[PDB]
């Protein structure tokens, strides 16, 4: 064996060792988050209601009058948790606040980019599917939310570029796990068309700038 770009590599029968893998696809270790330390201290007005139909978070206080400046950055910071009591409070609390938000979701959007990016940078497949389900739901919350993510395409999309190519190749096998929606590359195409439709006039050129293999869906 030998290293490249030497006189030992330029032999008639020598063997050259390749470069080490960079690690663009390997899972990264997690770090302690701020959602865990604010739930254990007791600031969140949430409680898990065990229902017969399923699991639903019960809110002691109304959801409309909550201070979304303090909680929306904090609840997105729970997207990096994988243990049971914190992963359910994270994503289910996110969707209900986005549902009953109204007019106040737009000014919090500058403060939401950093926990969005850190959720996708773990390179863990289960977190990526849940985070991408929120990103499709986030853009349809109000009217002018969609046009504000256009400056922030350069920070979210470089991780969406990596996993757009993954999909199943069972040439005639039926997919029996369509309900769970774990195909990341099926979700990324589904997510990116929602960014372009609600983005506005200048949405297409910004996505293709970051994701190179893109094709416009609104334009014919």
């Amino acid at each position: 064996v030998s290293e490249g770009f030497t006189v030992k590599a330029m032999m008639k029968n020598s063997v050259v060792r390749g470069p080490p893998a960079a690690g663009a696809f390997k899972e990264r270790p997690t770090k302690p988050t701020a959602f865990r330390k604010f739930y254990e201290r007791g600031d969140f007005p949430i409680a898990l209601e065990h229902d017969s139909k399923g699991n639903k978070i019960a809110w002691k206080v109304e959801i409309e009058k909550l201070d979304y400046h303090h909680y929306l950055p904090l609840f997105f910071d729970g997207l990096c948790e994988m243990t049971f009591p914190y992963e359910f409070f994270a994503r289910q609390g996110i969707h209900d606040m986005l549902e009953h938000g109204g007019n106040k979701i737009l000014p919090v959007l500058p403060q939401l980019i950093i926990p969005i990016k850190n959720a996708l940078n773990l390179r863990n497949r289960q977190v990526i599917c849940v985070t991408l389900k929120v990103l499709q739901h986030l853009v349809v919350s109000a009217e002018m939310v969609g046009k504000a993510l256009v400056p922030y395409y350069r920070q979210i999309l470089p991780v969406l570029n990596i996993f757009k190519n993954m999909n199943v190749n069972s040439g005639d096998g039926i997919d029996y796990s369509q309900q769970k929606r774990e195909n990341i590359g099926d979700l990324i195409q589904e997510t990116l068309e929602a960014f372009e439709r609600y983005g506005g006039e200048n949405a297409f050129i910004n996505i293709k700038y970051v994701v190179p293999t893109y094709e416009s869906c609104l334009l014919n």
């Binding site: 190519n165 999909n167 040439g171 096998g173 039926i174 997919d175 094709e215 014919n220």
Partner: protein, 186 residues
């Protein structure tokens, strides 16, 4: 293949509902994938072909390169979904003069070109689910002015969702179609 069989009314060479839909089609995939998933609009199984490159990912009939179909029926009808990405398909015919021709239908080409070996024409795909009806008999008498005898190969390229590629002897309306052949939207 279908020289011995009866040929009248319809002939079906693909269907997305079955044990082995792609038994006779040769699957060539490169930078792409093929699967079978439930549709969101018709609530039924459709085939899947996707890929960043249009040319490499296709399925061809028959699987053997030497074998030919030999279908005498004029019109080729396909039921596919518009996804607003690049898509092509070929049909190869046999004229009266016993010379094999081609007909390529690209949705991105704007120019129509005619040539003795291949004549490429544009196509416009309406949104949602739509049904393509092709005329092999008139397009041979228009491009080359020869008669029509038989059809040998059909290829379906990337970025489409395929269900029930079928031939016909003429163009029936939606009323004259049976229950199995018409697309049933809820």
């Amino acid at each position: 293949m279908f020289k011995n069989t009866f040929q009248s009314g319809f002939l079906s060479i693909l269907y997305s509902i079955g044990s082995k839909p792609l038994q006779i089609w040769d699957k060539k995939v490169r930078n792409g994938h093929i699967k079978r998933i439930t549709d969101n609009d018709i609530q039924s199984l459709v085939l899947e072909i996707e890929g960043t490159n249009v040319s490499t990912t296709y399925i061809t009939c028959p699987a053997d390169p030497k074998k030919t179909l030999g279908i005498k029926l004029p019109f080729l009808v396909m039921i596919i979904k518009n996804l607003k990405k690049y898509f092509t398909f070929e049909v190869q015919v046999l004229d009266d003069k016993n010379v094999r021709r081609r007909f390529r239908a690209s949705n991105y080409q704007s120019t129509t070109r005619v040539k003795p070996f291949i004549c490429t024409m544009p196509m416009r795909l309406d949104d949602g689910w739509n049904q393509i009806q092709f005329n092999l008999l008139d397009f041979t008498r228009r491009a080359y002015g020869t008669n029509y005898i038989e059809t040998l190969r059909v290829q379906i390229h990337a970025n489409c969702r395929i269900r029930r590629v079928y031939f016909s002897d003429r163009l029936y309306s939606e009323d004259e179609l049976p229950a199995e052949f018409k697309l049933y939207l809820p």
